[PDB]
């Protein structure tokens, strides 16, 4: 029952087009409320709320740490990006695609990164209507999954194809299911 | 495109903290403050990079210091409990006798404290379980994953039991084949 008090700190590096445009943010929070932050595009600490006022003024008076934060985009952001690039930015895990009835379901699992494209085809033609997706689901272990269902109006001998496009592949991945 | 976040937090009166690196929503690693070592989310990450775990403690000590100060400035205003929404799903499509993983996803909640228990046919399961630490969200609440490897069977039923001060009573998310 004892009331809780939480302090959170988030040092973020945002990358646009590789490392050409980098934005650094030094954020502080009391519970879930951000009270002070340093922004690369500003060059100083600004109080987000009155509780941060004393900090923004005191920290900005210290020319030693402002120098440090103003160089963060290079010494911290770009440096770390280079160190982790091979296993984060360039991580490629191909997906596993499964097609099963009961309405047709196309399950795409264990892929990374999240950018993917799943399409349903009926006799060589792409299906637009009767297609529902669950969206991108994170498993928490650096893999994603997604299910794309197709409302099916049965027929004799027609073939259904689930086509998947993903960065880890050379060409689209396919799975054909015939009744 | 991409975001790399070094996330930290200290909690009173539990006197516990966390220090982790996040890449586009996934944990690269977190620091075990008692063993003073770097715990990579995936083993292989350790073969490509390194991190001086002890450095994390310096940041955590400073975090507690700021907390002490903010606790007073705010006139001892405590945190407001936000109950988590729980989802239970599987790692891949289910097929009898084929290894799979049950995922209990706990989302949108604070403070970062939860009791998660897996139940098979109403009874506690602790063997083979693993979990992630608290992951940060953009709204500054938290996420957390708990796993249970299992062999799909028609005679077993599972429940993910979550306890959180934002809930009047334990929440139970059920799953069955």
């Amino acid at each position: 029952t004892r009331p809780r008090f939480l302090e959170q700190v988030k040092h973020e590096c945002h990358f646009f087009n590789g490392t050409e445009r980098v934005r650094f943010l030094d954020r502080y929070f009391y519970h879930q409320e951000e009270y002070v932050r340093f922004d690369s595009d500003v060059g100083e600490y600004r109080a987000v709320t009155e509780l941060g006022r004393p900090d923004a003024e005191y920290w900005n008076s210290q020319k030693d740490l402002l120098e440090q934060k103003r160089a963060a985009v290079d010494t911290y952001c770009r440096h770390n990006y280079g160190v982790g690039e091979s296993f984060t930015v360039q991580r490629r895990v191909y997906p596993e695609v499964t097609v099963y009835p009961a309405l047709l379901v196309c399950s795409v699992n264990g892929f990374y990164p999240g950018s993917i494209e799943v399409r349903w085809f009926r006799n060589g033609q792409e299906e637009k209507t009767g297609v529902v997706s669950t969206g991108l689901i994170q498993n928490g272990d650096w893999t994603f999954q997604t299910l794309v269902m197709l409302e099916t109006v049965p027929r004799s001998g027609e073939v259904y194809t689930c086509q998947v496009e993903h960065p880890s592949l050379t060409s689209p991945l396919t799975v054909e299911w015939r009744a | 495109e991409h975001v790399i976040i070094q996330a930290e937090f200290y909690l009173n009166p539990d006197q516990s903290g966390e220090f982790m690196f996040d890449f586009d929503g996934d944990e690269i690693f977190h620091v075990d403050m008692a063993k003073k070592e770097t715990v990579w989310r995936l083993e292989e990450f350790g073969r490509f990079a390194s991190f001086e775990a002890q450095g994390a403690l310096a940041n955590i000590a400073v975090d507690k210091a700021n907390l002490e100060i903010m606790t007073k400035r705010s006139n001892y205003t405590p945190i407001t409990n936000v109950p988590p929404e729980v989802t239970v799903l599987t790692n891949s499509p289910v097929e009898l006798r084929e290894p799979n993983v049950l995922i209990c996803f706990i989302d949108k909640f604070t403070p970062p404290v939860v009791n998660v228990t897996w139940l098979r046919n109403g009874k506690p399961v602790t063997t083979g379980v693993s979990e992630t630490v608290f992951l940060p969200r953009e709204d500054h609440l938290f996420r957390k994953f708990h796993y249970l490897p299992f062999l799909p069977s028609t005679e077993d039923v599972y429940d993910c039991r979550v306890e959180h001060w934002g809930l009047d009573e334990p929440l139970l998310k059920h799953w069955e084949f």
Partner: peptide, 7 residues
Amino acid sequence: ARGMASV
């Protein structure tokens, strides 16, 4: 990797 210091 380099750490950024909390202040």
